[PDB]
A paper describes a structure:
[name]–1 acts as a master regulator of neurotransmitter release, playing a crucial role in release itself and multiple functions in integrating the effects of diverse signals that alter release probability during presynaptic plasticity. Thus, neurotransmitter release is completely abrogated in the absence of Munc13s. This phenotype most likely arises because Munc13s play key roles in docking and priming that are associated at least in part to their activity in opening syntaxin-1 and thus stimulating SNARE complex formation through their MUN domain. However, the C1-C2B region and the C-terminal C2C domain are also critical for release, which may arise because these domains help bridge the vesicle and plasma membranes.
Here, we report the crystal structure of a [name]–1 fragment spanning its C1, C2B and MUN domains ([name]), revealing a long, 195 Å rod formed by 26 α-helices that packs at one end against the C1 and C2B domains. Key for the success in obtaining crystals of [name] of sufficient quality to diffract in the 3–3.5 Å range were the choice of N- and C-termini (residues 529 and 1531, respectively), as well as the removal of residues 1408–1452, which correspond to a long loop within the MUN domain that is poorly conserved and is subject to alternative splicing. Even with the best diffraction data obtained with [name], structure determination was hindered by low resolution, significant anisotropy, non-isomorphism and an inability to obtain selenomethionyl-derivatized protein. These problems were overcome by the use of single wavelength anomalous dispersion phases obtained from a dataset collected at the tantalum LIII edge on native crystals soaked with a tantalum bromide cluster, coupled with molecular replacement phases obtained from the previously determined structures of the C1 domain, the C2B domain and the nearly complete MUN domain of [name]–1. The structures of the two molecules of [name] present in the asymmetric unit of its crystals are very similar. The structure of [name] can be viewed as a highly elongated rod spanning ca. 195 Å and is formed mostly of α-helical bundles, with a total of 26 helices; the C1 and C2B domains pack at the N-terminal end of the rod. Comparison of our [name] structure with the crystal structure of the almost complete MUN domain (with the N-terminus at residue 933), which was described in Yang et al. (2015) and we re-refined, shows that the MUN domain is very similar in both structures, as expected because this structure was used in crystallographic phase determination by the molecular replacement method. However, the structure of [name] shows that the MUN domain actually starts at residue 828 and contains five additional helices (helices H6-H10), resulting in a total of seven helices for subdomain A.
Author numbering: 541 to 703, 708 to 758, 774 to 800, 808 to 922, 929 to 1037, 1053 to 1190, 1197 to 1341, 1353 to 1403, ...
The structure:
């Protein structure tokens, strides 16, 4: 076949359209009474007296009821010419022949495009086409002269019969001969497999097949016209009134060079017509015909090829669903082409609705297209569409809206194949539409990621312009990943909205891309940790960029909405390094700042402290803007940074301590004071930073380090105050001997206090007034406790008489109390120095 059959189908199609069934002569029925027992042509009902009057055709001579005249199937002219042939009245035979010629000329004249189309579809020359045409014209004029055929009908089985059971048997009548099969009892899907033979010399002796339930009940019938018989047929017929019946017919006519059934011929015609209008004419594009709407899928071409397939199918008994199911199997070969997925989805939806009182899968087993054929086809098409979607971004760019439509409609066709499996083939299908599409999108994402990971620089440099010596590659890669996820979020998600609660293209994109990029980045940083050939600033910016990505696209995904992020672990060592370098820079800035402050003259606090804390706060700003979500790691950062702060401020304290015993001389009296003020300033702003780092929320180790540091600082300030008080010891000794000389003069009370205190009064007013101006609270009080200590120490080393010293003692007590600005009396009274001096006085205070 394919060469012999192709030609046979060519001939039969020509003959099928040169005289179409659309322009057929209508019978002319007049009331008729049968004088002898006749039987109706359709229902075979009896015709007799005036009580059973029928109708008669004045040209055919066919006999039927009034209620049956419309249900006939037999060309009027062909029947007439056949009758004249049975007889011999040749005059009318030729007359009718002439009228047939005329009605074929009419057709060739009116619609000549059809026959040239047939010519080109089968690639037949003009000459041979005219000869073969000329031949079929005459074959139409011979509907009896050269027709006879031995028929062999094997009744195989039936299905879905209407009864709660039945005992069906089949009767097969040709012309006068009538036979029947065995009876199967209690079976609505029986099997006969009975063979019969028939002679069909006539032409209007149709093969009547009727199924009865064992007068008997009527279960259905199929009438097989003679025009629809070739070679060896195996056909399911729907019973007319209910189920179907399967017949295996074989025909022999005369010279039938092994003709093939008209189903096979039809698939040939449809395949070649498709392969013509698609490839040869449109060069490849599958022209999509009109639609709208209830009978859209019922149309395949325009009024120029639709006529060919339809007239071929009607005049040879090919059912509509066979047409549709062959056309689908043709489109399947052109599913990739634009606009086809849609019509294939609708077409399959109708093939699906046509098959959904017998099961659905078994009913579908009755389709003559092919039990396994159609399901194998559908399987190949499904397994093909998933391959086509596994590269959807490449095969369906977001650019062309039409291509995006072909994507949406491809997913629709896939859902329709599955739906066909769930409502027709009948079975549980683990391949669920949404989940299969999901799998395909995942595969496409993997391919895409590997593609941008193999062409990072090329693509980046093409649009926005891995190494151990450089990190630019990762910045570019992140940028391109953002591009991909943004395209999946902007274009492909609105298009693939077939499954809103199970397929959010954007979120799958985000998740997959992040996972791949995450294991890649992780490995890369684990590699960089051993080597470390780049700047800490670079690792920092990369930490910042990965952060931005995760927070922008992944953090809010259900899979990663549940804490904790994993990426900050990749970077912890590098930021540790950055903290070391930062520490070193901060020390060098401390030294450099204290040189400007010394060289300037130390102009209530100076500028070096706010400079140091400005530096440290610049450093801390970076750690705070990292917004690290892993609590243990951020706690690690604070743990490491507390050490930085501690060593910095201790460095300050040690430097000033080195230069303290040098500015205390009787020269600069503002400088030491403002230095101690600076230490105190460290003491106050440290706490501000302590709460800036969390406060009590801070880690245990770090918090411990900072408070221990606080202790240390306080101790430093104490030591400093001590050293500063020692600066005045000689002057105080002078005052104590100067008052010691007047101490002996007094002899026989209130005025004497002033005369004895005058030497130290200069110190009291002159110094406690100067410190009151440029000293901090804590600073001043420290100096006061120390100075007091040293006063009591000195007045116990050099030295009416008795009362004077005690009253003066109270006077000094009040002067150091300074009313309410200096020390508190509660301390002065229970002071260890005061009671020591009083105890010393008790030895002489006897008179
Ligand atoms: Cl073929
Ligand atoms: Zn008629
Ligand atoms: Zn009738």
């Amino acid at each position: 076949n394919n060469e012999e059959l192709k030609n046979h189908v060519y001939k039969k199609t020509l003959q099928a359209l040169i005289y179409p069934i659309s322009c057929t002569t209508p019978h002319n029925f007049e009331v008729w009474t049968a004088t002898t027992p006749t039987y109706c042509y359709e229902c075979e009902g009896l015709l007799w007296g005036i009580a059973r009057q029928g109708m008669r055709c004045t040209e055919c001579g066919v006999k039927c009821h009034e209620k049956c005249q419309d249900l006939l199937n037999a060309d009027c002219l062909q029947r007439a010419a056949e009758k004249s042939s049975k007889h011999g009245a040749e005059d009318r035979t030729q007359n009718i022949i002439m009228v047939l010629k005329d009605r074929m000329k009419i057709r060739e004249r009116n619609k000549p495009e059809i026959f040239e189309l047939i010519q080109e579809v089968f690639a037949v020359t003009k000459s041979a086409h005219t000869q073969q045409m000329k031949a079929v014209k005459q074959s139409v004029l011979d509907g009896t002269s050269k027709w006879s055929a031995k028929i062999s009908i094997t009744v195989v089985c039936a299905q879905g019969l209407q009864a709660g059971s039945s005992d069906p048997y089949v009767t097969v009548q040709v012309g006068k001969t009538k036979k029947r099969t065995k009876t199967i009892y209690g079976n609505l899907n029986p099997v006969w497999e009975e063979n019969f033979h028939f002679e069909c010399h006539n032409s209007s002796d149709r093969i009547k097949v009727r199924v009865w339930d064992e007068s008997d009940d009527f279960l259905g019938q199929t009438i097989i016209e003679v025009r629809t018989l070739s070679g060896e047929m195996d056909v399911w017929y729907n019973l007319d009134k209910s189920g179907a019946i399967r017949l295996h017919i074989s025909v022999e006519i005369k010279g039938e060079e092994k003709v093939a059934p008209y189903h096979v011929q039809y698939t040939c015609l449809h395949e070649n017509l498709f392969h013509f209008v698609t490839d040869v004419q449109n060069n490849g594009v599958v022209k999509i015909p009109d639609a709208k709407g209830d009978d859209a899928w019922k149309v395949y071409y325009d009024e120029t090829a639709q006529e060919i397939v339809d007239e071929f199918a009607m005049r040879y008994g090919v059912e509509s669903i066979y047409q549709a199911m062959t056309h689908f199997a043709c489109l399947s070969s052109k599913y990739m082409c634009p606009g086809v997925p849609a019509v294939m989805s609708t077409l399959l939806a109708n093939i699906n609705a046509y098959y959904a009182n017998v099961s659905a899968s078994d009913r579908f087993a009755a389709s003559n297209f092919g039990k396994e054929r159609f399901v194998k086809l559908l399987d190949q098409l499904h397994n093909s569409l998933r391959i086509d979607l596994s590269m959807y971004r490449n095969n369906f760019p977001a650019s062309s809206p039409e291509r995006l439509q072909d994507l949406k409609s491809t997913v629709d066709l896939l859902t329709s194949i599955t739906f066909f499996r769930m409502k027709v083939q009948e079975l549980q299908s683990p391949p669920r539409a949404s989940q299969v599409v999901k799998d395909c999108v995942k595969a496409c994402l993997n391919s895409t990621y590997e593609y941008i990971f193999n062409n990072c620089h090329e693509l980046y440099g093409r649009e926005y312009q891995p190494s151990i010596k450089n990190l630019d590659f990762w910045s570019k890669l992140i940028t391109l990943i953002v591009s991909i996820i943004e395209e999946d979020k902007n274009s492909y998600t609105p298009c693939l909205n077939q499954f809103p609660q199970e397929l959010n293209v954007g979120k799958i994109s985000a998740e997959v891309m992040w996972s791949l990029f995450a294991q890649d980045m992780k490995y890369a940083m684990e590699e960089h940790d051993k080597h470390r050939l780049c700047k800490s600033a670079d690792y920092m910016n990369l930490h910042f960029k990965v952060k931005w990505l995760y927070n922008e696209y992944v953090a809010e995904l259900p899979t990663f909405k549940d804490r904790v992020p994993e990426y900050p672990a990749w970077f912890e060592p590098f930021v540790i390094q950055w903290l070391d370098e930062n520490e070193e820079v901060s020390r060098d800035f401390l030294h450099g700042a204290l040189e400007r402050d010394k060289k300037d003259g130390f102009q209530l606090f100076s500028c070096s402290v706010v400079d140091v804390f400005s530096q440290l706060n610049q450093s801390f700003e970076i750690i705070k803007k990292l917004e690290c979500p892993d609590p243990q790691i951020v706690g690690h950062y604070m743990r490491r940074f507390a050490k930085t702060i501690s060593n910095v401020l201790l460095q300050y304290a040690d430097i000033v301590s080195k230069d303290f015993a040098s500015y205390c001389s009787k020269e600069k009296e503002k400088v030491p004071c403002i230095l101690m003020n600076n230490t105190q300033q460290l003491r106050v702003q440290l706490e501000k930073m302590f709460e800036a780092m969390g406060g009590k929320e801070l880690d245990a180790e770090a918090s411990g380090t900072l408070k221990e540091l606080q202790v240390k600082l306080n101790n430093v300030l104490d030591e400093l105050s001590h050293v500063f008080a020692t600066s005045f010891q000689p002057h105080i000794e002078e005052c104590v001997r100067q008052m010691g000389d007047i101490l002996s003069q007094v002899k026989g009370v209130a005025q004497d206090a002033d005369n004895v205190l005058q030497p130290i009064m200069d110190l009291l007013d002159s110094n406690l007034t100067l410190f009151a101006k440029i000293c901090e609270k804590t600073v001043l009080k420290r100096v006061l406790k120390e100075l007091w200590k040293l006063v009591m120490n000195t007045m116990e080393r050099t030295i009416k008489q008795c009362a004077v010293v005690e009253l003066a003692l109270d006077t000094i007590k009040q002067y150091f109390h300074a009313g309410g600005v200096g020390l508190k009396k509660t301390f002065l009274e229970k002071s260890p120095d005061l009671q020591s001096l009083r105890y010393a006085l008790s030895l002489y205070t006897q008179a």
